[PDB]
DNA sequence: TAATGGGTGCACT
DNA sequence: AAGTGCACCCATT
């Protein structure tokens, strides 16, 4: 159980996924929304994996809490196959639109390394 | 396996549910969409597991929709009175008024009237 | 958005 | 009767 800290001051819950993607895409993890509402978003691996990420707003702390549950995946983590999905390409395009040069560089290198079949 | 006839000339998957509601609501059957795509819609009983299934499929060859009822057996009682208290029925009823479906409105008015009087 | 658990309709894929 | 991503819900404390 991992309590992420610190967490950005999200203005919209829809800022959460892209932020988690930057973190987990490099790990070869491809997160999707299992459930969401105004005050929570729960993530799992894209399709029987027990890996979970629970984001929920805390009134007491006036912030979003993000907790990582159960790191043990029931599958292989392969970043190479991830770069082919549509969610990844949109994530990548989003990075550019937000002019996140640092992240953009990180993923260009990751993609290049992957194209060389180097361990990830 | 029961084929329904006659079937109106639907021009969109989304026109099918409202038609099916007019037919099955009076039978104490509350249909929901299990799944849909541009050429197929699968319906079942709202979850309140029941095997009952309705499948509407578009024949490209015949350029018409065919509707079939499967597993006509239910795992639950069929109560119209309970149905009338749901949000989807109320929305269904308002849709009839929107469409100026005078005859349908009359029909369901009587069904509700009899329902309120505990009349079977 | 009390905190925290889960249900399920349904269109996308 | 495609499987599942996602969000509109509800339940219990
Ligand atoms: Zn939003
Ligand atoms: Zn996983
Ligand atoms: Zn049923």
Q: What is the DSSP letter of B86?
A: S
User: Element (H or E) spanning A115, and its range?
Assistant: helix A101-115
Nucleotides of C under 7 A from a protein CB: 1-13
Can you name the residues that pair with B42 across neighbouring β-strands?
B35, B55
Is B53 annotated to bind a ligand? Reply is no
Distance CA A107, CA A98 (A): 15
Cβ-contact B67, B51 below 8 angstroms: no
Cβ-contact B22, B32 below 8 angstroms: no
Phi-psi region of A89 (alpha: psi -120 to 50; beta: other; left: phi over 0): alpha
Distance CA B72, CA A53 (A): 41
Cβ-contact B65, B16 below 8 angstroms: yes
For residue A74, say whether its CB is under 7 Å from any atom of strand D.
Answer: no
Q: How many residues does chain B have?
A: 120
**Which residue is nearest to the C1' sugar atom of C4, using CA?**
A56
Q: Is B119 exposed, middle or buried (0-12, 13-18, 19+ CB in 10 A)?
A: exposed
Q: How far is the CA of A44 from the centre of ligand 2 (A)?
A: 7
Kindly tell me the sign of the dihedral angle through the C-alpha atoms of A83, A85, A87, A92: positive
Nucleotide nearest to A37 (CA to C1'): D7
**Which residue is nearest to the C1' sugar atom of D5, using CA?**
A33
Is B60 annotated to bind a ligand? Reply is yes
Adjacency order of strands within the sheet including A52-58: A2-3, A63-69, A52-58, A40-45, A31-37
Cβ-contact A15, A91 below 8 angstroms: no
Q: Which two tokens stand for residue B38?
A: 């541009």
Q: What is the CA radius of gyration of chain A?
A: 15
DSSP secondary structure letters along B39-62: TEEEEEEPP-----EEEEEEETTT
Q: Which two tokens stand for residue A36?
A: 């969401």
For residue B77, say whether its CB is under 7 Å from any atom of strand D.
Answer: no
Distance CA B14, CA B8 (A): 13
Q: How far is the CA of B42 from the centre of ligand 3 (A)?
A: 14
Nearest Cα residue to B46 out of B61, B26, B31, B58: B31
Nucleotide nearest to A85 (CA to C1'): C13
Distance CA A69, CA A55 (A): 11
User: Element (H or E) spanning B102, and its range?
Assistant: helix B102-116
Q: How far is the CA of B50 from the centre of ligand 3 (A)?
A: 5
Residue B78 CA to chain centroid, in angstroms?
Answer: 13
Nearest Cα residue to B57 out of B112, B115, B117, B3: B3
Nucleotide nearest to A47 (CA to C1'): D4
Query: What's the N-to-C CA distance of chain A in angstroms?
Result: 23
Q: How many residues does chain A have?
A: 120
**Which residue is nearest to the C1' sugar atom of C7, using CA?**
B47
Q: Which two tokens stand for residue B93?
A: 């009823």
Is A80 annotated to bind a ligand? Reply is no
Distance CA A120, CA A97 (A): 26
DSSP secondary structure letters along A40-77: EEEEEE------EEEEEEETTTTEEEEEEE----SS--
Nucleotides of D under 7 A from a protein CB: 1-10
Distance CA A1, CA A36 (A): 20
Residue A91 CA: distances (Å) to CA of A35, A41, A85, B16: 20, 18, 10, 36
């Amino acid at each position: 159980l991992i309590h992420l800290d610190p967490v950005p001051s999200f203005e919209d819950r829809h800022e959460i996924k892209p932020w988690l993607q930057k973190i987990f895409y490099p790990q070869g993890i491809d997160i999707v929304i299992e459930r969401s509402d105004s005050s929570k978003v729960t993530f799992k691996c894209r399709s029987a994996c027990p890996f979970r990420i629970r984001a929920a707003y805390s009134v007491r702390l006036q912030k979003w809490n993000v907790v990582v549950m159960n790191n043990i995946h029931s599958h292989e983590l392969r970043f190479d196959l991830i770069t082919k999905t549509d969610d990844y390409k949109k994530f990548k395009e989003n990075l550019r639109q937000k002019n996140d040069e640092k992240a953009i560089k990180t993923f260009d290198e990751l993609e290049y390394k992957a194209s060389l079949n180097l361990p990830l």
